[model samples]
Target: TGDQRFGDLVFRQLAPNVWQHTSYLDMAVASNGLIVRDGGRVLVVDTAWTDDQTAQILNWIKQEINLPVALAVVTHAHQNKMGGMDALHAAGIATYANALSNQLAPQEGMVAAQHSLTFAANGWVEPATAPNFGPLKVFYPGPGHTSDNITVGIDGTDIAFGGCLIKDSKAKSLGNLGDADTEHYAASARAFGAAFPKASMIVMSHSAPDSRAAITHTARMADKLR
Candidate 1:
């Protein structure tokens, strides 16, 4: 069979097994990290904007690998990242997020809240049920970007998905603090630096990946702002 394309979105391989999808608008992006254990299982980091976009990525995954999505990690409680939970769940994939994600999800405005519930109803499944798929690790590193934000480390890899906490080289500024406490964001940045001192690569939910120098550069930028 032939592979299908979703409008203008194209998938680019970042590392050996890690891949990211760049959308047409360039404002929205999603990543899927692969850990080919036995057959192969993916850890979808975030869901993009529309269902069609999400479906396109899922179809690509199906064509490339045989294993199902063993886990789906929502970097934060944002709609762009959490919107497609329903599609993932319907495919029998397990979902995970910070404990605070469940708490703050409802506060994302009426439309977003409704979408979340609808997704949940259609198998937007959560481990909150049983057998607990796995741990929903929470890193309350002291409020950076948002109070509920958390960074997910890719198991054995030195890569850490800093979500919106860290910025890539393409980012000229630091981060938005309208919803975040400035002082707290600074503290969180420091804490994150300490937490993953050995992380060789840092991937921002947006933009390209960065090295330790980029991490330090962002931290310094945050420091000056505060």
Candidate 2:
């Protein structure tokens, strides 16, 4: 258990140069973001649920990682992912997201990322040409949790951040489908699983890191609705 608490965030190392940052919402539910160290700088995968929580994360990085945050990528337009955009922007950390996520953020009262990456029509970024913010790779596996939900992976490692698209193993339901694409949820999960077959550790916004089976678990949950 990587339980080191700093301010409102808890950090647990997932791999070399990578850590899971956890924050709570309404003092109940937990959300996760990622921190990857690269080239004497850091690349964060998502933001906390609020600006204050994210500011604490920045402070922790400033004192512990001792490197400036080179980039921040939000997985979707949800509060747990993009709510801290203002904090990152204030820290001068460049933010990136899928083009659709950026477009959807404003609709959710969230801040759009500073930059956006366009995926191919199939919702995948070609492996050889995928943009690398350090070792991070972005992919949009169609629509699941949200129309713009995307997954983030680190090169040379099995870690992938699925945000809210993949549910925790114990989740008996699909969780929140308020903005989800139920009709395509199962297929989207399959696409994500196929896109990263080697991803054994899948991080999500709602729970502790889970295994690749979670991808299948989520798909099955969605299938039940059909």
Candidate 3:
């Protein structure tokens, strides 16, 4: 009872190897991220909403999954995903982003993490072919939600992290567009769907796990919103 959580975030398992941490940024904005068990190591996609939140998620992995975090891949420049990069570094975990995102982060008033060649072909170019790490793979499809948003695939799961690109299962419309690339929205979703047709799990930034309808729904909404 000494160190109490802020009562803002909740963590749970989405599958045998994937866990999700859901939290709030404000009364209106929500965040959902994944911690995946990969071989003897783990990978985090979009850290928690804050430092303490990341710490707790890491702790949970150590205590429950028994795997140390080997890497963290934030999907974009926004705080919901890049918010805890400093804390992640403090914990000795390696962090990464596609080069575009790494440079854009501090320009947006956030610090850049250690940058490297994105899993993509070039920082901004998608490789003609994808690479693999167990069942997890990273895709840098063209812009949608943000210029640097990336899609990730895990064993039994697939996600765009879609940032603000896709909708939730219950959402009636696309959620946010303050920094979106409306011109490429639908095309990007099509790219991801084409890459992972068998992806059974959908993980959008502000919603619960879901279906392909989430992406197509977002594509449909982008038509009107843009």
**What Cα-based lDDT does every candidate model obtain?**
0.58, 0.86, 0.71
lDDT of 2: 0.86
Q: Give residue 99's error in model 2 in angstroms.
A: 1.7
Q: Which stretches in model 1 have alpha-carbon errors above 4 Å?
A: 1-7, 24-39, 109-140, 175-177
Give the distance in Å from residue 132's predicted Cα in candidate 2 to where it truly belongs.
4.6
Order the numbered candidates by TM-score, best leading: 2, 3, 1
Best of the two (2, 3) by TM-score: 2
lDDT tens per residue, model 3, 114-144: 7543554432333422222445567776788
Q: How would the candidate models be sorted by lDDT, starting from the highest?
A: 2, 3, 1
What TM-score would each prediction reach against the true structure? 0.74, 0.94, 0.85
lDDT of 2 by residue, 100-202 (tens): 8888888889999888778887777655443557688788988888888999888878898888999977788887657888889999988888888888999
Error of model 1, residue 154, in angstroms: 1.7
For residues 127-192, could you state the per-residue lDDT of candidate 1 as single tens digits?
Answer: 343222232222345566776666655444576667777777556887584776577676676667
10 residues in a row with least lDDT, candidate 3: 123-132
User: Distance from true position, residue 38, model 3, in Å?
Assistant: 1.3
Candidate 2 positional error at 220, Å: 0.7
